[PDB]
């Protein structure tokens, strides 16, 4: 019974509780869950950015996050269950029961981590770290594995929390080729700790249209604080899906080898601040934009850079309407632990992301374009000021990573 080829009838969810949401050539449903996860990404990204200073870089994986809480939702109930459904926009899949979201998420996951004869690498790894002493719901254990491939590794939080903490940390590190290390802050995790849910995503790809290192040069990058700084500017000319949108904002899509995944950059005109664009970046707007890209010849100016970000998801989420899940008194997670202890609540939620962009990725290459004469009136895209960045799986219309490059300098 392979879930990736299974009919909803072949995967009994038998969840503790249920919620009824109100009101191309791919899967109608994974298409919808895709729309869902994106509504969360933008909304959550907006919130996140609003709480950050304009010169700070931002990076995270809305997919990871949506996946994590979707995993938690499995044992959620009542108001915790609704709030989760509402906050992560799953409730926006008309008349669909909270449990269907999971079959869908199962389908979405299959497509994303196809592992086929591809060139780009996109991997996912979810794992439950529970206290060896606790007895978790069988169904919760079962479904978490069938739908998200999450195993339930027993750890001793009661006695060796710290040793248990290193275990988790070490596992994430392995699943993220060491780019994501101490996911968990020493402070967290202790004897009281019973469960640590974790979702990892790891992607590495080569530019389908190479940037010759030989052309990379220093250029000034203009921060939002009116200052400048020296950055490494990659350069190349060629055809890319592009589009000049509202108030001169430039949208550009750089695909990776395989064509399934791309990097989309949103660059406002020097006049307009990125903060303005972020406040206007609506799910429906970002949709309109993406759908409007058209192939074109342009000059691309884009800085190399590494971005490492980490933050608590707790506050942001609460502001967005996720409260019960964090309330020792209001939380409702009966489906997770079996026999008593029912009032389990999420004490904290953390996210740590990594991003490195350059030529080659993996100092040894060059490019030679002979007999080329492009239009002297060709359109240029010079990313020497803050801009947004996305790493999406086009065919599935999924945002795997998003962020902001407000300072690529050194």
């Amino acid at each position: 019974v392979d879930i990736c080829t299974a009919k909803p009838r072949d995967i009994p969810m038998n969840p503790m509780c249920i919620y009824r949401s109100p009101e191309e050539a791919t899967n109608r449903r994974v298409w919808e869950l895709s729309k869902a996860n994106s509504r969360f990404a933008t909304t959550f990204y907006q919130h996140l950015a609003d709480s950050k200073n304009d010169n700070d870089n931002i990076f995270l994986s809305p997919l990871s996050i949506s996946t994590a809480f979707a995993m938690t939702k499995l044992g959620a109930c009542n108001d915790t269950l609704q709030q989760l459904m509402e906050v992560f926009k799953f409730d926006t899949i008309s008349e669909k029961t909270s449990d269907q979201i999971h079959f869908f998420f199962a389908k979405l996951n299959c497509r994303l981590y196809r592992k086929a004869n591809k060139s780009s690498k996109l991997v996912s790894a979810n794992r439950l770290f529970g206290d060896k002493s606790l007895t978790f719901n069988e169904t919760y254990q079962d479904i978490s594995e069938l739908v998200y491939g999450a195993k339930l590794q027993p750890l001793d939080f009661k006695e060796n929390a710290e040793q248990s903490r290193a275990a988790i940390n070490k596992w994430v590190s392995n699943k993220t080729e060491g780019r994501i290390t101490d996911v968990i802050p020493s402070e967290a995790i202790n004897e009281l700790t019973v469960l640590v849910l974790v979702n990892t995503i790891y992607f590495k790809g080569l530019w389908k249209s190479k940037f010759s290192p030989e052309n990379t040069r220093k250029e000034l990058f203009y921060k939002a604080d009116g200052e400048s700084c020296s950055a490494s500017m990659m350069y190349q000319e060629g055809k890319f899906r592009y589009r000049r949108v509202a108030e001169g904002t430039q949208v550009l899509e750089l695909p990776f080898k395989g064509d399934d995944i791309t990097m989309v950059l949103i660059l406002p005109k020097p006049e307009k601040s990125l903060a303005k664009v972020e406040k206007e970046l609506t799910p429906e707007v970002l949709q309109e934009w993406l759908d409007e890209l058209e192939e074109m010849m342009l000059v691309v100016h884009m800085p190399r850079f590494r971005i490492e970000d980490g933050f608590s998801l707790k506050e942001q989420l609460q502001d967005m309407g996720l409260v019960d899940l964090f309330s020792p008194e209001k939380s409702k997670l009966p489906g997770i632990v079996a026999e008593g202890r029912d009032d389990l609540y999420v004490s904290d939620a953390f996210h740590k992301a990594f991003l490195e962009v350059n030529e080659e990725g993996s100092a040894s290459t060059a490019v030679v374009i002979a007999g080329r004469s492009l239009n002297p009136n060709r359109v240029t895209f010079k990313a020497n000021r803050p801009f947004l960045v996305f790493i999406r799986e086009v065919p599935l219309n999924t945002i795997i990573f998003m962020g902001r490059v407000a300072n690529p300098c050194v």
Binding site: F59, T176, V183, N199, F203, H351, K352, G361
Partner: peptide
């Protein structure tokens, strides 16, 4: 590009 998260 190389990206990761957790």
């Amino acid at each position: 590009s190389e990206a990761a998260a957790s």
